[PDB]
Amino acid sequence: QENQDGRYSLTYIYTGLSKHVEDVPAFQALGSLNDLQFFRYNSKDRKSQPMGLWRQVEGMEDWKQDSQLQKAREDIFMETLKDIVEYYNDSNGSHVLQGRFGCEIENNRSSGAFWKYYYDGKDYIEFNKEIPAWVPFDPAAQITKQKWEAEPVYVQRAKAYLEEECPATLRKYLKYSKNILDRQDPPSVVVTSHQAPGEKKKLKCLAYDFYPGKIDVHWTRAGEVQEPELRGDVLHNGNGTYQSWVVVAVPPQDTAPYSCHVQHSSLAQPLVVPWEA
Ligand SMILES: *[C@@H]1O[C@H](CO)[C@@H](O[C@@H]2O[C@H](CO)[C@@H](O[C@@H]3O[C@H](CO)[C@@H](O)[C@H](O[C@H]4O[C@H](CO)[C@@H](O)[C@H](O)[C@@H]4O[C@H]4O[C@H](CO)[C@@H](O)[C@H](O)[C@H]4NC(C)=O)[C@@H]3O)[C@H](O)[C@H]2NC(C)=O)[C@H](O)[C@H]1NC(C)=O
């Protein structure tokens, strides 16, 4: 009777667009606790709203207050994207600035942190909290490097936000979310055959209503494992559950037995469902 393990992750993805249409929001931000997203905010609606299972959780976060400082961040974000675009003279062109910012804890202790920006998919700038300093990866990023380090203090706060302000927020959220994130829901599995007129028969094995997401689902033909013709995976965020299915194509003659094997953490011994033809 064996391992420790309690690692939890808090991540934000920020997205801006230089050229956007009326209905499409210019700025957007969402935050995830582990693999599940707990809140979104955009520049159109201009309101911080909780998402998924976190709609029923009260008093974890002052959403009105959060909207405020989200707005603050939106300003600094787009202003940066403007500066990149203005620098490349491509004022009229559809460009993307994406920002990833986050920390994580393992066994109650800070174990890692990251703060990185991307431009049109390419590495733009990055915080090295060891120095501490920002690290340009793009010629344009030299300007931002100078702005964000204008005062020597700024670099010290950036280190503080990652190393302390973030994990502090994480733990706070964890008081309300530990129960959610720690779930070990087993999958119900369902086998289904289907025939297309001028097509080989296809056997679908669906695993559903499970969490966490890490799952092995594979077919076997008369003992040997078969490579799937197609595999599908889904996260139902409102539900806070996962769904995953695998389809194999069985030749017209084939009389050999097919069974679906599901392996998930919430199960002691593996789950096997045979296709009762
Ligand atoms: C969280 O949310 C998700 C999505 O919002 C919910 O998904 C639903 O899950 C329930 C079970 O909790 C499913 O109920 C059905 O149960 C019977 C067994 O008693 C099964 O026969 C069903 O199996 C599905 O999949 C089969 C093969 O893949 C398919 O042949 C079958 O038709 C059925 O769903 C299919 O049919 C429906 C009806 O038209 C289609 O709408 C659906 O797209 C289709 N699915 C697929 C890809 O095959 C099935 O499990 C519901 O089917 C399922 N529905 C949805 C909208 O996803 C989930 O229930 C919920 N969980 C919790 C814990 O709250």
From Swiss-Prot:
Tissue expression: Blood plasma, seminal plasma, urine, saliva, sweat, epithelial cells of various human glands, liver.
Modifications made to the protein after synthesis: N-glycosylated. N-glycan at Asn-108: Hex5HexNAc4.
Compartments, as annotated in UniProt: Secreted
UniProt-recorded Gene Ontology molecular function terms: protein transmembrane transporter activity; RNA nuclease activity
Disulfide links within the chain: C103-C166, C205-C260
Gene3D superfamilies listed in its UniProt record: Immunoglobulins, MHC class I-like antigen recognition-like
GO cellular component, one term: extracellular region
PROSITE patterns the UniProt entry points to: IG_LIKE, IG_MHC
Positions bearing Pyrrolidone carboxylic acid: Q1
Top-rank lineage group of the source organism: Eukaryota
Coiled coil, from the record: none
Glycosylation sites: N89, N92, N108, N239
InterPro entries: Ig-like_dom, Ig-like_dom_sf, Ig-like_fold, Ig/MHC_CS, Ig_C1-set, MHC_class-I_related, MHC_I-like_Ag-recog, MHC_I-like_Ag-recog_sf
Single GO biological process annotation from the record: antigen processing and presentation of endogenous peptide antigen via MHC class Ib
Record keywords: Disulfide bond, Glycoprotein, Pyrrolidone carboxylic acid, Secreted, Signal
Domain Ig-like C1-type: from-to ranges: 187-272
Described purpose of this protein according to its UniProt entry: Stimulates lipid degradation in adipocytes and causes the extensive fat losses associated with some advanced cancers. May bind polyunsaturated fatty acids.
Family assignment from sequence similarity: Belongs to the MHC class I family.
Subunit composition and interactions: Interacts with PIP.
Protein name, UniProt field: Zinc-alpha-2-glycoprotein
Lineage of producing organism: Eukaryota, Metazoa, Chordata, Craniata, Vertebrata
Gene (UniProt): AZGP1
